[PDB]
Amino acid sequence: AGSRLETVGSIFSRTRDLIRAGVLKEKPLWLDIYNAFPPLREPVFRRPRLRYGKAKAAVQDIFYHEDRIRAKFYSAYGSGPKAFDLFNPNFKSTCQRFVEKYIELQRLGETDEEKLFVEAGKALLAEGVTLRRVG
Amino acid sequence: HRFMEPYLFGSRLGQDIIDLEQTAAHLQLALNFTAHVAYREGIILFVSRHRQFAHLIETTARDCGEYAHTRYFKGGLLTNAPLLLGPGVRLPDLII
Amino acid sequence: GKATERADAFRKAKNRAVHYLHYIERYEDHTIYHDISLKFKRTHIKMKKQPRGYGLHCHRAIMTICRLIGIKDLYAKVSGSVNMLN
Amino acid sequence: SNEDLPVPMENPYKEPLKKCILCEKHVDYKNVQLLSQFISPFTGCIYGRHITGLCGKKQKEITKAIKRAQILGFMPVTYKDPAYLKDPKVCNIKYRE
Amino acid sequence: IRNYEEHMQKHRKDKAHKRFLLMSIDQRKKMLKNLRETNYAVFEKICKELGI
Amino acid sequence: VESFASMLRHSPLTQMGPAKNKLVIGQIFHIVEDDLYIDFGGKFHCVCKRPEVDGEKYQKGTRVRLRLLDLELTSRFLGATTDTTILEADAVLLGLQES
RNA sequence: UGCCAGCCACCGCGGUCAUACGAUUAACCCAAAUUAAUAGAUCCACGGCGUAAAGAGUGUUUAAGAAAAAAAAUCACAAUAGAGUUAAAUUAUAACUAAGCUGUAAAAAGCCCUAGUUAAAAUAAAAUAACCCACGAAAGUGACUCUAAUAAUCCUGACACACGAUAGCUAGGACCCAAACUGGGAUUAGAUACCCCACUAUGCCUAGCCCUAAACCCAAAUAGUUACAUAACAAAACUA
Ligand SMILES: [K+]
Ligand SMILES: [Mg+2]
Ligand SMILES: [Mg+2]
Ligand SMILES: [Mg+2]
Ligand SMILES: [Mg+2]
Ligand SMILES: [Mg+2]
Ligand SMILES: [Mg+2]
Ligand SMILES: [Mg+2]
Ligand SMILES: [Mg+2]
Ligand SMILES: [Mg+2]
Ligand SMILES: [Mg+2]
Ligand SMILES: [Mg+2]
Ligand SMILES: [Mg+2]
Ligand SMILES: [Mg+2]
Ligand SMILES: [Mg+2]
Ligand SMILES: [Mg+2]
Ligand SMILES: [Mg+2]
Ligand SMILES: [Mg+2]
Ligand SMILES: [Mg+2]
Ligand SMILES: [Mg+2]
Ligand SMILES: [Mg+2]
Ligand SMILES: [Mg+2]
Ligand SMILES: [Mg+2]
Ligand SMILES: [Mg+2]
Ligand SMILES: [Mg+2]
Ligand SMILES: [Mg+2]
Ligand SMILES: [Mg+2]
Ligand SMILES: [Mg+2]
Ligand SMILES: [Mg+2]
Ligand SMILES: [Mg+2]
Ligand SMILES: [Mg+2]
Ligand SMILES: [Mg+2]
Ligand SMILES: [Mg+2]
Ligand SMILES: [Mg+2]
């Protein structure tokens, strides 16, 4: 009638083996689609072993040079007066504007962090935004 | 989960980010496979045990003309089909 | 298959047997492809490939399974526990 | 060629670790006031970590400093010195309910 | 080794230091044997000077 | 065609940084007698109680202001291989959105 | 025939309806041999050591053997042996008041040279800190201070050297308190036991011996891997 073993192999592997054996005389309709279009990974059962020892995960942290600049702004001025809005795909945050002007300012050849940070704050003040320093 | 490591682009401040490039490749085959089994007059069942989209998924299957099962799943449904449903029952050819 | 009566025990076992089916590859339909050495729980069973002439020199339970699968040339040695289920 | 990929850098948002009350400060067996604030005024017992809140380094030093003053003759043993009963409260235990 | 012997002569019933004294002698004995099988000229001078 | 990596860099979520103490506006999508299910654009929905002042104007689709503390509440207990999520988020109400 | 007479290589049979004893019919298997008895061929571990028989109480070293890629002297805290010291409690002892005081599920016995309060040596033991997890090779160590001090330029190793809780022995000193043995009371059919009261060896210091533990984290030392893979249970599996 069929095979009900989950761990032997994929559904494709068992179906074509039974058909080749001669027990299943009616080819399932989904089988033809599978041969033409195979998935990226064949569905083979594998036991979720727990990781022991010095082995760690290979997932990398998502960090950018922008994040380093954002840390200084958040540490000094805290959260900006503008309210973050995640519904707008093209939203421009106050911190993001600070980073963008920070990148443009450092293209002039300035290396000192203090000069870059102070001038960016003064430049933002010229645009009308509020940068009340925390503490 | 340990098996989802290859599909993860990375982790952002302790929050995992799924690599959409691999999602697009998988979703392209999934939709392509779904249509073909529907083209050949195949039974498609929507299964989702989540009590926030149960009505939406149930209505989605009605519009498509296909079947949905978002309620409690009985133990011997797909395996012991003849006793649960009826003497001669055609098993679904695809489950979503 | 387990039941209160021996006659009912046979009936349950037969019907439930066809639900669990394997496909065993047979090199030239007379032998396994290569020598296999495995240790399932506490049962050590070692099987070896053989030519056509010398066939079916294995444990009496293995010979019964081999004739059903179709293998006609095999050598098997069972070490450790000889429990039928294992 | 893609410059949008993340770089392997340490976390820039690592908030500095919390400092204990007596961190970077020198405890002593001669200042009774500092040692007296960590003693129950009614009984004279020494509070644990879950009440004092000090770290693992300044808890042992306070314990050793207190016991040195007990024998050398600088503070009472079975009660808190009443002269230092009005010092600011640092422990997290409340008796009156 | 000389420091342990001075300590042992005072505190006779100490057993932790007596174990250290015996192991220190054994380690020096092992190292002297290794030196002898590699550089005999240096081993003779060390043996004569230290009184070992 | 814009590469997926470029999308994350300019996304508002990445520009937010740490989720603690961030002023984020949200929209209410479900109303109970005392609980307001608010969606702030994150993965899950935060739950807050109706304030005693101007409580009659908190209706479906109304925009409010939130202070995110944890993007997703999740903790680990002993004997648990995997953390037990709460499928919610933690936030507080600072008032209604000033249109 | 009726657990009788008897049978069996192992498991077993016979206790008035035995395919197992004895006889009969029939059958099976060897065959000029068959069966029994004793020797021999063969047969244990290139397998195992948390729970099964099995990691020896600990460390160093000799004989011996490994090295082969890389890399590695540690460390706030209660190691140890000396010297000095005492906070809280208890007792000798004195004063005062009271006639009772101790004890149990309930009592008796004991005490009345007693109890409460105030004043107070010696001996012994080390509240809270400790919801910390440090030191030592192990057994062990956690009141304070000082002195001396924790091997190896950083592998394995015995029957050899050194050590080893507690109980026990020999000699001297100490004795608050606890306490095998012993005596009394109670319980019980009996109680040379559990429960109550008294007291000794002894627990303590100095010197010597004994060398035993569920000395158990029942998991040997040094380098490693998370691959392969669930007997059961427990503290996941494995390689050199
Ligand atoms: K004490
Ligand atoms: Mg057997
Ligand atoms: Mg006979
Ligand atoms: Mg008869
Ligand atoms: Mg017989
Ligand atoms: Mg007979
Ligand atoms: Mg044993
Ligand atoms: Mg054992
Ligand atoms: Mg050993
Ligand atoms: Mg040994
Ligand atoms: Mg040698
Ligand atoms: Mg001594
Ligand atoms: Mg009486
Ligand atoms: Mg008295
Ligand atoms: Mg006396
Ligand atoms: Mg401890
Ligand atoms: Mg050592
Ligand atoms: Mg050392
Ligand atoms: Mg050695
Ligand atoms: Mg001893
Ligand atoms: Mg003793
Ligand atoms: Mg003794
Ligand atoms: Mg004698
Ligand atoms: Mg004596
Ligand atoms: Mg005595
Ligand atoms: Mg006594
Ligand atoms: Mg008696
Ligand atoms: Mg022990
Ligand atoms: Mg042992
Ligand atoms: Mg051991
Ligand atoms: Mg060893
Ligand atoms: Mg070592
Ligand atoms: Mg190791
Ligand atoms: Mg089971």
Tab-separated table of N, CA and C (backbone and C1' of nucleotides) and ligand atoms in Angstrom, chain G residues 165-168 202-204, ligand 21:
chain	number	residue	atom	x	y	z
G	165	A	P	43.850	10.757	59.567
G	165	A	O5'	42.370	11.267	59.864
G	165	A	C5'	42.015	12.626	59.654
G	165	A	C4'	40.526	12.799	59.468
G	165	A	C3'	39.644	12.411	60.644
G	165	A	O3'	39.576	13.424	61.631
G	165	A	C1'	38.730	11.558	58.628
G	166	U	P	39.731	13.061	63.187
G	166	U	O5'	38.664	11.903	63.426
G	166	U	C5'	37.279	12.192	63.526
G	166	U	C4'	36.461	10.929	63.598
G	166	U	C3'	36.815	9.975	64.727
G	166	U	O3'	36.233	10.335	65.966
G	166	U	C1'	36.674	8.769	62.708
G	167	A	P	37.002	10.018	67.340
G	167	A	O5'	36.895	8.437	67.484
G	167	A	C5'	35.636	7.814	67.687
G	167	A	C4'	35.710	6.323	67.483
G	167	A	C3'	36.670	5.567	68.383
G	167	A	O3'	36.155	5.335	69.681
G	167	A	C1'	36.950	4.837	66.163
G	168	G	P	37.113	5.483	70.961
G	168	G	O5'	38.226	4.364	70.745
G	168	G	C5'	37.886	2.986	70.774
G	168	G	C4'	39.075	2.110	70.470
G	168	G	C3'	40.313	2.341	71.317
G	168	G	O3'	40.232	1.729	72.592
G	168	G	C1'	40.936	2.185	69.047
G	202	U	P	40.247	7.550	78.273
G	202	U	O5'	39.416	8.140	77.048
G	202	U	C5'	39.362	7.460	75.802
G	202	U	C4'	38.256	7.997	74.928
G	202	U	C3'	38.448	9.410	74.403
G	202	U	O3'	39.280	9.462	73.258
G	202	U	C1'	36.264	9.183	75.278
G	203	G	P	40.147	10.776	72.942
G	203	G	O5'	39.081	11.808	72.360
G	203	G	C5'	38.415	11.546	71.136
G	203	G	C4'	37.305	12.533	70.878
G	203	G	C3'	37.684	14.003	70.931
G	203	G	O3'	38.284	14.455	69.730
G	203	G	C1'	35.675	13.651	72.132
G	204	C	P	39.844	14.833	69.692
G	204	C	O5'	40.003	15.935	70.829
G	204	C	C5'	39.491	17.245	70.652
G	204	C	C4'	40.039	18.191	71.689
G	204	C	C3'	41.553	18.217	71.825
G	204	C	O3'	42.175	19.043	70.856
G	204	C	C1'	40.567	18.056	73.969
H	21	MG	MG	41.042	9.948	66.943
